[PDB]
Design a protein around this ligand. Structure first.
Ligand SMILES: COc1cc2ncnc(Nc3ccc(F)c(Cl)c3)c2cc1OCCCN1CCOCC1
Ligand SMILES: COc1cc2ncnc(Nc3ccc(F)c(Cl)c3)c2cc1OCCCN1CCOCC1
Lengths: 124, 271
């Protein structure tokens, strides 16, 4: 379904990417964080964790994840934890493996972000 | 046989729903002649392990020995109950947060505020004499209840159980900076509670919600990493200013114990 928005409407795909860009900045700019590139800036799991707290109304204690991950393994653990926060919030288990996000798979990244956008687009 | 059967869920009379949120549902009800509140907990991936843990953690909350501590009256084990459930007495004025910030009929005066502070300090001093809890306790104005005679009581039902996600913090404005950043086992948990009391003092002085203009994520990140602190209120007595500053010491080891500030607050009472 989303895969058709991805592959066989590449100017719709670019339209979705700018929508997701505007959505994540609405929230992350509150922490003085700016997103300009969806292909890489969610790969280490940090902004996904911060975004979930901004969207669902909680702080994530810094001992619960790796704010500055120093290995592929810590980035995978961050993304897995963000996936757990997503399920806590009512989303079904995300389809991509956490390593797919860390590896900057654009489709996996956009699928996860799009499901957040579908759910939380009206949060202020 | 088990040492506790807990409260029989079938004996609960559910009267009216009070609230529902991420953590579960609150109901006003009745049980064995008591006016009660029931919390039905929402838990993802409930398991026998988590149920065993709930049943081991609840007995410690049944504290009947201090006027400024509100006990859990009991808990419903699940199974056989549909969901893990907590019961406490109905407190007619609700939480301290409700009384200070959502009070449409009266504004509590500062003599009552100083009495609330003394009540909370006495209850915390007593709790701090007990062996540590497995559930995480957090002192804030939502976890203090105001009884029918206006006595403030620490609510034992508001602990966070081992199966409730430690990764989601919903009232960070009251949490000590070190507790935003370090695992509980790496902090002095009793000194962290003094910071929370300092923020309660600030709330009693200003009658404002701390960091009301910020989201919980913004609060935790700015307090932990950018040194955000409550602004010391203008035009208060030097004595109150001094007490609030010592309770909010950046160094956890230099904060007073609750049993040290109880006599200070006693001398500040009107009667
Ligand atoms: C007088 O009202 C309450 C008394 C309460 N007395 C004791 N405990 C309460 N809450 C509580 C909190 C956690 C628990 F696990 C349990 Cl068992 C109970 C209480 C919650 C109470 O009210 C909760 C709903 C507060 N409303 C919600 C709607 O907007 C206005 C304030
Ligand atoms: C290191 O000693 C404590 C740590 C604690 N850490 C966290 N919480 C404590 N108590 C506590 C705090 C809040 C509560 F709601 C309840 Cl029920 C109990 C603690 C009580 C503690 O000590 C209680 C006094 C008796 N112990 C016994 C042995 O060594 C230390 C002193």
């Amino acid at each position: 379904a989303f895969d058709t928005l991805f592959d066989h409407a590449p100017d719709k795909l670019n339209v979705v990417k700018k929508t997701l860009i505007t959505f994540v900045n609405k929230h992350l700019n509150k922490l003085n964080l700016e997103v300009t590139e969806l292909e890489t800036q969610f790969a280490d799991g940090v902004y996904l964790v911060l975004l979930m707290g901004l969207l669902e109304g909680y702080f994530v204690p810094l001992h619960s994840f790796f704010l500055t991950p120093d290995s592929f393994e810590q980035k995978v653990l961050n993304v897995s934890f963000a996936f757990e926060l997503m399920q806590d919030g009512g989303l079904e288990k995300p389809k991509p493996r956490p390593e797919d996000i860390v590896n900057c798979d654009l489709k996996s990244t956009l699928r996860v972000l799009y499901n957040l956008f579908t759910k939380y687009r009206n949060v202020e | 046989m088990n040492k506790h059967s807990g409260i029989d869920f079938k004996q609960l009379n559910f009267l009216t729903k009070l609230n529902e949120n991420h953590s579960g549902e609150l109901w006003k009800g009745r049980w064995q002649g008591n006016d009660i509140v029931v919390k039905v907990l929402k838990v993802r991936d409930w398991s026998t392990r988590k149920s065993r843990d709930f049943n081991e953690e609840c007995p410690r909350l049944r504290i009947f020995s201090h006027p400024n501590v509100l006990p859990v009256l009991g808990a419903c084990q699940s199974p056989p109950a549909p969901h893990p459930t907590l019961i406490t007495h109905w407190m007619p004025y609700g939480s301290l947060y409700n009384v200070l910030h959502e009070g449409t009929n009266f504004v509590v005066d500062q003599s009552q505020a100083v009495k609330f502070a003394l009540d909370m300090a006495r209850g915390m001093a007593f709790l701090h004499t007990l062996e540590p809890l497995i559930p995480r306790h957090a002192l804030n104005s939502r976890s203090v209840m105001i009884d029918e005679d206006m006595t403030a009581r620490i609510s034992m039902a508001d602990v966070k159980f081992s199966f409730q996600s430690p990764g989601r913090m919903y009232a960070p404005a009251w949490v000590a900076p070190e507790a935003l950043q370090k695992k509980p086992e790496d902090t002095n948990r009793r000194s962290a509670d003094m910071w929370s009391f300092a923020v309660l003092l600030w709330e009693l002085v200003t009658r404002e919600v701390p960091f009301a203009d910020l989201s919980n994520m913004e609060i935790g990140m700015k307090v932990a990493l950018e040194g955000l602190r409550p602004t010391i209120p203008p035009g208060i007595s030097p004595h109150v200013s001094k007490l609030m500053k010592i309770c909010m010491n950046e160094d956890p080891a230099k904060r007073p114990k609750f049993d040290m500030i109880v006599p200070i607050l006693e001398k500040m009472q009107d009667k």
